[PDB]
């Protein structure tokens, strides 16, 4: 459906392009005005950032008993990646151009969930399989230079005006549970942490999955079910009369 | 049934926490007020301690037929976790602004005996798998740095039985303060964090002083006041009904 | 981000200047108003300051045992660089314009912590490294004479007014560590310097790392810690509880 | 933990300090009063204790088969140390006019088993080190003059057990002068250096005569006295309540 960034997702409609104009790739790469796309992408594996480690130990410090360090350079990777031999497609020749001149240009890889990762780097190596069985394939790695641009960069922090849960009141069957749905207010609020608690333990328990709440009528009676956000600013209190059965 | 430290547990509902406080970290582990959780863990290995050999074998040694060695520096080792990836979220951000920063914090590993392991450390790799069939996971490795927290050193602690608030019922008129007594089942507990807070800011507002609540009646009505302990294990619940001057 | 001289600084972006003026060049060498940068260092070792031995013995003393000598004349020492051989800067034509004329020229060495040093000398050496495979490289060596103003002469000392512990009061569980925390009022402070102590080493133990301050509750009780500073016109006594496990 | 000097130590916690006092350094190295630590060393070598040969040959022996030689003149050799360059701390201000000067000051080595060495010399060389992916280092060289006080001297001493200060409590009146008495155990103790500070200035007044601490009463009120040792291993607290006349 439409695309939510705060929600798990398949890799299934990922896509790379590499950007032909003069401008600056990093001020909007949403938009695919002078982009290339290098289609049938058969397998994807983005650069990994790494850091090394820099000693900060002194002979004059009380004791050597634990190891101390700090995070030293960084470095992002290597990307690889493998496609349809396609000699003739224009971007296949344009990736060979890039191989052969040696300079640095920029790629960026889109998600379906509607976020984009921009990174810069020169093409390092270029090989080719052949069977008689399967399809020629052309295998790209490309070593990158610099901070990259990922999409965490990109998304805005949106705070919260209300939070609710539904249904407020409810009647539960001792040995049957019951589904109790939160929200938060708006649809875009970054922070949906939050935690849900019993009273009463023995007249009722809670369990948390997702954003459902189940309670398990356990003793009849009336038990109050306060439900608190991870920042702790909104409180909502759920009141469950339990019948025996 | 009750979770027992002393007898065999499975790894369902380990939890990972970050830690987002200016105190000590390692003073109350248990409490889950200033964490923040990192959901959808696929993966979890953690940090392995070892220690160096140091050669303790001299010229005169009259029996050199084996050999002789001690303990020397002791390392926390490297942590390292999977993830779903969702850049919309408020923890994945904060990750990558602490790989980029690149200074030493706190974490956390919740285990299903209750039970607590706490670390200091620096991020020092980030990744990305994508496939068709698959969720995008992100994989994060931490490089510890100092002496870590074990359940072993918490292994002679008093838990809690139960929470009180009193007085349960108050009304309270415009203007005016009231106080509320929190206490713990026995006197010997240790963990004594709790927050109060209020379904409705403007029917009323809760201050925390010590173990005393006060609440003041900005606007007339019926309110519910819950408190939450900062383990988040019990709960209890105040209605005060506030009446108009 | 933190230009402080009074803490370790890794050495990138340190520059090299020559003074092109008719002024005094130690007067005011935090201002770059003519001086010209020498850009693309690949390395650089500045002057070593040693000074000679004088004999100080003479034959009537009775205790020729053991060797008196005393400081004789002190040397500047020789400054080392490499930079990116360009031979169309203007830097550089300076340079071997320096060089050929055997003039006795000033020039700065700018650090990332905010402080200069400044030297006065001639060009001894001049070469070249020529590789299939790397860069040209420009090699210069300067003999300084006289004294130089090293970044230690232009530091300003500032007096203390007051020393904190923060927290005061805490209690620490037995087989726990506490973070302690001393600051100096105000931010400006030279000396730093402070000795924290235990009154009863059973009871509670102290170590010192930087500014951090960790005890240890090895026995429960009231336990007072005082920190005296260095200078010793302040005083802070933290009063610690260890409780019992 | 382990101050034995009877068997190995490591050489983690080795201290480097400065005399700035009038008196004699050799007289009580163990104390810790008028000197300054010189903070995060990176590495220390101490210099070697050398004596040249004196030809004892003559024309009349009877054997010349083998060589006769005797001890010579004695030399304290050089001691050569590297610290982290922090210009705007004091001590190394002071370790810059130290080698401006051209005087003649004593320093000390202390070791983590609780023994002391005590040279006097004069610097001989200041170096830097400047690199983009380490810290910036100080190398620094002192040519020793005369002889040192190895720890070997001071193998005959008393440790001391404990420090009491009498009475602990005591209430004083505005303008009224009361008597401290501070002890060490045993009777024996060699070093009885120790230092009596005031938490509050205004609120009460110390002045240190001999054995006896004499303390004012200009403010009414609670102020705490800590008494530390010179070598500072031992912790002595009093409390004062001046009451208003």
Same mark, same amino acid.
Request: hydrophobic residues 35%.
């Given at each position: 459906p439409? +695309?939510n960034?705060?929600? +798990?997702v398949?890799?299934? #409609?990922?896509?790379?392009?590499?950007?032909?104009?003069?401008?600056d790739?990093?001020?909007?790469?949403?938009?695919?005005?002078?982009?290339?796309?290098?289609?049938?992408?058969?397998?994807?594996?983005?650069?990994?950032?790494?850091?090394?480690?820099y %000693? %900060?130990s002194?002979?004059?410090?009380?004791?050597?008993?634990?190891?101390?360090?700090?995070? #030293?350079?960084?470095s992002?990777?290597?990307?690889?990646?493998?496609?349809?031999?396609?000699?003739?497609?224009?971007?296949?020749?344009?990736?060979?151009?890039?191989?052969?001149?040696?300079?640095?240009?920029?790629?960026?890889?889109?998600? +379906?969930?509607?976020?984009?990762?921009?990174?810069? #780097?020169?093409?390092?190596?270029?090989g !080719?399989?052949?069977?008689? !069985?399967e399809?020629?394939?052309?295998?790209?790695?490309?070593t990158?230079v #610099?901070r990259? $641009?990922?999409a965490?960069?990109?998304?805005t922090?949106?705070?919260?005006?209300?939070?609710?849960?539904?249904?407020?009141?409810?009647?539960?069957?001792?040995?049957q549970?019951t589904?109790?749905?939160?929200?938060?207010?708006?649809?875009?609020?970054?922070?949906? $942490?939050?935690?849900?608690?019993?009273?009463?333990?023995?007249?009722?328990t809670?369990?948390?999955?997702?954003?459902?709440?189940t309670?398990?009528?356990?003793?009849?009676? !009336?038990?109050?079910?306060?439900?608190?956000?991870?920042?702790?600013?909104?409180?909502?209190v759920?009141?469950?009369?339990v019948?025996?059965?």
């Amino acid at each position: 459906p439409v +695309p939510n960034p705060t929600m +798990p997702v398949k890799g299934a #409609g990922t896509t790379l392009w590499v950007y032909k104009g003069s401008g600056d790739p990093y001020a909007n790469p949403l938009s695919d005005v002078d982009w290339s796309r290098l289609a049938k992408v058969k397998d994807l594996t983005p650069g990994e950032l790494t850091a090394e480690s820099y %000693d %900060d130990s002194y002979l004059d410090d009380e004791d050597a008993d634990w190891t101390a360090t700090g995070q #030293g350079q960084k470095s992002a990777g290597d990307t690889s990646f493998t496609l349809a031999w396609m000699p003739g497609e224009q971007g296949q020749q344009a990736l060979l151009a890039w191989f052969n001149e040696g300079d640095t240009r920029a790629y960026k890889i889109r998600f +379906p969930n509607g976020t984009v990762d921009v990174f810069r #780097g020169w093409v390092s190596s270029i090989g !080719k399989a052949v069977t008689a !069985k399967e399809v020629i394939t052309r295998t790209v790695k490309v070593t990158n230079v #610099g901070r990259p $641009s990922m999409a965490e960069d990109r998304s805005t922090v949106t705070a919260a005006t209300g939070m609710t849960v539904t249904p407020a009141s409810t009647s539960v069957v001792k040995g049957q549970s019951t589904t109790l749905t939160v929200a938060f207010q708006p649809e875009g609020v970054t922070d949906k $942490s939050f935690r849900a608690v019993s009273a009463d333990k023995t007249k009722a328990t809670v369990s948390v999955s997702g954003m459902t709440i189940t309670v398990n009528g356990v003793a009849a009676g !009336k038990v109050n079910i306060p439900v608190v956000s991870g920042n702790g600013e909104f409180a909502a209190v759920a009141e469950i009369t339990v019948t025996a059965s």
